[PDB]
């Protein structure tokens, strides 16, 4: 069939070669690698704080680098910056579009980002002489809804869209310096590495790709899930990451091993994962499910170590502070809860 | 609490007061999601946001059109709309099955299972012209049209053919069968026959949203 036969066959062999290489490299499973360590026991985490200012469901949240300030987006079309220690609303930013599916907290803390069904990433300046939060850069160029956005630095931001592409922008010029292509379905999440030289993205093709930011190429492609990937989170070491999909299973992929190390699922869990996160040490993997409850997984033993029950609707976002003090969980009941 | 901490707390209180004002503005507004096909004609009825006003009630209609053909993810954002407005092309029998499948997926969608659907069979004039002519037959794409007779409750419009009544009500009963095959009364389908020149669609949306929220209040008060 000319190309339709030749390229399909060469690929089919190449995929078989990758599978054989992974089988050869699979010397021993991580589960047995850790079958001797002490059980992490149960991590009972109590709702220490409850932030109630949003008017509808909360789609996303993000922590500041100082592990005290957090931003959050909601269906009411407003962006609210909270002081988690004192529950104070530091800012309330009205949004032009009320369908914002993501928000981002600049590591320097000067700016904030927001985007959604409007296919535009909006950057808001917090520290301005006028005294009010003002939009500074509206990044257009994506042909689909913006699933996620993360600040590389004060002038560079990496966004993932539902147009099957991720982009690296430059807020100064407002143009895409790099476009990452290769995903078959929508890119639902992206996670920046600790060194920020590369990032991973989970798409609706049940695959996650590792992109090198500088060269703009996909270094590796990881498969193993059977449903759309909704959540992605880089391991604190930076040499691994975890994915949360609608199969109701979480999987841990190692960059160097290029394969899944462990699947975090149980037979009675039939609800997809909306968000995942790691602790400072990377021992607990917190996953927010559709069953209105977040589970805390032992990242090395696959056994559920705790439940973050208390949210009365879907847990949409879930993030851990940079200092690991607390876990903030946003849900569709319009409330953010901080757990310690 | 320092003087600055007190001032910050006060500022947060004023932010909360502005949030309460926005709550008053936001609760009174009813959100409607406009879905349909490319040829459905939903434009007459990226994001094309509309805000109309019927009897002092604020409605906000959203026609998402800046995305790709894959809508299994961005459609979950509308889990809390008052109703989903589904527009179909009644004349195009070829894509009628595609419209039925989309309606079935929306109806049985885990998250859109609590959202009522206002159904707008749009191109009624085109459907009537096609039925009167011999251009195509419904039974080709739907063999069950043979064994189907106009419903007793069907109210024909004056001066209309009984065969046009048969066609339009069969097209409406396919959607109705899909809708009442499940859902156990949490959400309801509201079928309407529409024309491109119709001007009462706003009143229809008003009445049907009124019924939707009335039934919601009855159910939440345990009055069925």
């Amino acid at each position: 069939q000319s190309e339709l036969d030749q390229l399909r066959q060469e690929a089919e062999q190449l995929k078989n070669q990758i599978r054989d290489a992974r089988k050869a490299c699979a010397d021993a499973t991580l589960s047995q690698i850790t079958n001797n360590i002490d059980p992490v026991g149960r991590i009972q985490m109590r709702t220490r704080r409850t932030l109630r200012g949003h008017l509808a469901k909360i789609y996303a949240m993000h922590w500041g680098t100082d592990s005290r300030l957090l931003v959050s987006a909601s269906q009411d079309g407003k962006l609210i910056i909270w002081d988690s220690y004192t529950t104070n609303k530091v800012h309330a930013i009205p949004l032009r579009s009320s369908w914002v599916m993501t928000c981002a907290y600049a590591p320097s803390g000067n700016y904030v980002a927001c985007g959604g069904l409007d296919n535009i990433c909006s950057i808001y300046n917090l520290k301005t002489r006028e005294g009010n939060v003002r939009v500074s850069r509206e990044l257009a160029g994506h042909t689909g809804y913006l699933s996620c956005c993360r600040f590389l630095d004060d002038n560079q931001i990496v966004t993932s869209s539902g147009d099957t592409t991720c982009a690296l922008w430059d807020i100064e010029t407002g143009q895409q310096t790099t476009t990452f292509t290769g995903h078959t379905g929508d890119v639902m999440s992206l996670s920046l590495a600790p060194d920020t030289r590369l990032f991973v993205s989970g798409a609706c093709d049940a695959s996650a790709k590792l992109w090198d930011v500088r060269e703009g190429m996909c270094r590796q492609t990881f498969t193993g899930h059977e449903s759309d990937i909704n959540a992605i989170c880089f391991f604190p070491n930076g040499n691994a990451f975890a994915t949360g999909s609608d199969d109701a299973t979480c999987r841990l992929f190692d960059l160097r091993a290029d394969q899944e190390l462990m699947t975090y699922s149980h037979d009675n869990i039939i609800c997809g994962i909306t968000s995942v996160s790691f602790s400072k040490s990377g021992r607990l993997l917190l996953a927010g499910y559709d069953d209105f409850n977040c589970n805390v997984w032992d990242a090395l033993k696959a056994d559920r170590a705790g439940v973050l029950a208390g949210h009365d609707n879907r847990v949409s976002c879930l993030g851990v502070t940079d200092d690991g003090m607390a876990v903030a969980t946003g849900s569709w009941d319009s409330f953010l809860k901080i757990w310690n | 609490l320092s003087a600055e901490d007190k001032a910050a707390v006060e500022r947060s209180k004023m932010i909360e007061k502005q949030l309460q004002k926005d709550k008053q503005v936001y609760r009174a507004t009813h959100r409607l999601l406009l879905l349909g096909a490319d040829n459905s004609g939903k434009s007459t009825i990226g994001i094309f946001e509309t805000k109309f006003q019927v009897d002092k009630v604020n409605f906000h209609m959203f026609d998402v059109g800046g995305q790709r053909d894959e809508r299994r993810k961005w459609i979950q954002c509308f889990n809390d709309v008052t109703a989903i407005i589904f527009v179909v092309d009644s004349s195009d029998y070829n894509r009628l099955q595609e419209a039925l499948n989309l309606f079935k997926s929306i109806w049985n969608n885990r998250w859109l299972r609590t959202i009522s659907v206002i159904l707008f069979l749009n191109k009624q004039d085109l459907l009537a012209e096609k039925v009167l002519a011999g251009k195509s037959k419904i039974e080709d794409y739907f063999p069950e049209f043979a064994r189907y007779t106009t419903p007793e409750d069907a109210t024909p419009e004056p001066g209309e053919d009984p065969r046009v009544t048969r066609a339009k009500y069969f097209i409406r009963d396919e959607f109705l069968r899909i809708s009442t095959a499940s859902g156990d009364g949490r959400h309801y389908c509201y079928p309407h026959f529409t024309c491109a020149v119709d001007t009462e669609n706003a009143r229809r949306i008003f009445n049907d949203c009124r019924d939707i929220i009335q039934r919601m209040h009855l159910r939440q008060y345990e009055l069925l």
Partner: nanobody
């Protein structure tokens, strides 16, 4: 890795019979609704039939109603489509499609232009 390999298509004279098989790998078959879709030349994607997780609920398009029968076998993780009385309007490449999520009754975006969980296709052409 979700792989949907389907085969069984060939040149058959009108009114004949044909069995289409779709071997599914990389996922638990028994918890996914399975679909059959086709793309006749010069046209777009279109749905043909679907079968529930267990097989109790089965539906087909009006065009293929009464002549096409879809059966799944969860033991071997495969999907079947037995076609009878083929017609010249049925010449199309047939894809084997899966619901995006498990334990669900809503196959969303199955007939999309670029769907991830869909097979390559079998060129089923019927002519005299």
């Amino acid at each position: 890795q979700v792989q949907l390999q389907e085969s069984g298509g060939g040149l058959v004279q009108p009114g004949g019979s044909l069995r289409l098989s779709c071997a599914a790998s990389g996922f638990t078959f028994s918890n996914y609704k399975m679909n059959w879709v086709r793309q006749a030349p010069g046209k777009g994607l279109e749905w043909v039939s679907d079968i529930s997780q267990s097989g109790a609920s089965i539906s087909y398009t009006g065009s293929v109603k009464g002549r096409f029968t879809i059966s799944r076998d969860n033991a071997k993780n495969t999907l079947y489509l037995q076609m009878n009385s083929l017609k010249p309007e049925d010449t199309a490449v047939y894809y084997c499609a899966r619901c995006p999520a498990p334990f669900t009754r809503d196959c969303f975006d199955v007939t999309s232009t670029t769907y991830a969980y869909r097979g390559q296709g079998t060129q089923v052409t019927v002519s005299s």
